[PDB]
Amino acid sequence: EDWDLVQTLGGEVQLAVNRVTEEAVAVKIVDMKNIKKEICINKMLNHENVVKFYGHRREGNIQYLFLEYCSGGELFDRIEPDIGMPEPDAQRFFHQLMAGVVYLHGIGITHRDIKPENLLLDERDNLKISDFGLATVFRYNNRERLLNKMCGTLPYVAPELLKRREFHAEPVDVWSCGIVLTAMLAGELPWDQPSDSCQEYSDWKEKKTYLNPWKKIDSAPLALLHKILVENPSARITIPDIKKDRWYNKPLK
Template sequence: MAVPFVQDWDLIQTLGEGAYGEVRLLVNRQTGEAVAVKVIDTSQGKECSENVKKEICINKVLSHPNIVRFFGHRREGPTVYLFLEYCSGGELFDRIEPDLGMPEREAHRFFQQLIAAVEYLHSVGITHRDIKPENILLDDKDNLKLSDFGLATMFRHRGRERRLNRLCGTLPYVAPELLSKLEFSAQPADVWACGIVLTAMLAGGLLSKLLRALPEERLSISELKTDPWFSQTLTSSSSHNKLLCSDTQLHRNNSDRVQFSSSQPDPALGVCVWEGSVCVGGADQVSFSQPARPDNMLLGSQLLGTPGASQTPWQRLVRRMTRFFTTLDSSASCSALRDTCIDLGHTFKHTCTNQVTVSTLDRRNNKLIFKVHLMELDQRVLLDFRLSKGDGLEFKRLFLKIKQKLSDIISTQKIPLPVT
């Protein structure tokens, strides 16, 4: 999908995709500045067009350091281009090791920033409705940025609050009342999703006061902010997790790993677990994980705060753990990848010269699809894995398995930093 009005920008890679379009990383060949553009084709459905209009309206009213900034949009026929802040640090879920999580100090800081973003959203009457690690980005200074407002909606206007009735989001992060009630309050549903994100960051710790099934018994954000664990300043990694009040326990059950993703609470502890990680907003929803920010494409002004010309092409790629360089050429690397995927029982398909699509089922028998781009950078071959459909942590587990089986062809050579 081209960007017709953009000049002097080279396409580096596709960052994310949805039912009606994709997000592309572009680099200015004159200045070396890197941007991303979210491209949406609205010709395939009226609902898509309406969702995009709502997403634009919501983005226009948002201004918070932990929310991706919106710089404007442009329409060319049925295609809409959204311009937002580019977050080169990648997605939060890339920091979460399956079944290990991340250091408590990091999780604590990211969670505080996430709550700050959600509290701000609620203060202006907006609910996100699809909070998950894949929709949480990091900038070049490792600050959290909540992104992707394709499913967001307004629940309060001029002091009047309405209850919601649309079931949407991603199932492992959906609050139980969305599945059991005709109407529900917006704010507790977002708080539940934040609790599941923290669960994933801390490798499956059940947060009893955030994840209570009854929304009226769930902690509010104002109550959460007074909690000793949340409000403390962590100066070093702790040897244990306090996890939101004394009656909350960290449960690690290795025997359950075959059944449950670490993004889900343990059902044995009294919390419902939904089988599946598919998006329940419908197949036609527009959902991306990486936004964009080329204000100079709109105004002709110079981009600020983006990587400069001193960086090599591989350094301008958005940070992602799910990639590695190989010691082979493109053809041999692709053959090795194909053999490994087939040995693991996955479906392997060439979609174009430098891209393959792999389809399989995760441990809960839900569809998992990812693409692998083969790129030649600095006379080396990079295999870049990107999730297309399914649970992000399940995708990470599968990537690690493939990487282990290909360990004999993975390059360990260090790439020199640019001379400044």
């Protein structure tokens, strides 16, 4: 037995390999010099579309998180700039993304930073939601708490987060999944940020779909995107309804 730190995956994250079994695991080194909540949240998780948590180890000042190694890399690296990826592949990743998000929201957890860098792939190209450093509990004892903290990455963040003092957690993760779908299908992010001062975002609200990235997207998935990227979070489509959408259920090969 004994693990070797073979290389840098991305503190930092190193790839550890068992000297006997040759089994691998990602080790996240968190120089505490987030983390507490991240370990806590990780302990509650167990789902095939969420990066597995093996355990942790303080060992002084460097906190060590032991996480599932995803040999396929980041979804981010499967997206060709300006092109996207084949629709069938994007749909399968999107189905898997919704499976992971339904699970998280089911146990009252919001990820808050969904984007392709945080969606990793295993050996069989199964999507795994990664990094719970920004995650939080939005439901406890069956009572929902509204969020107010600015968390996320601008291009993927929901507009309410920039405009409202308080907002529901779930539609924010739905929105970020819609920007991920756009990136998969167009190899392009639609706007720097979702604010009226951003020309691209204003054009979308005025339905100028003849512009990029929308023009590269087929009408069926674009119809789903019209339901997800709705400014008013109360009017935005919910996950159960996304799962009933026409494109979501279209057979593709």
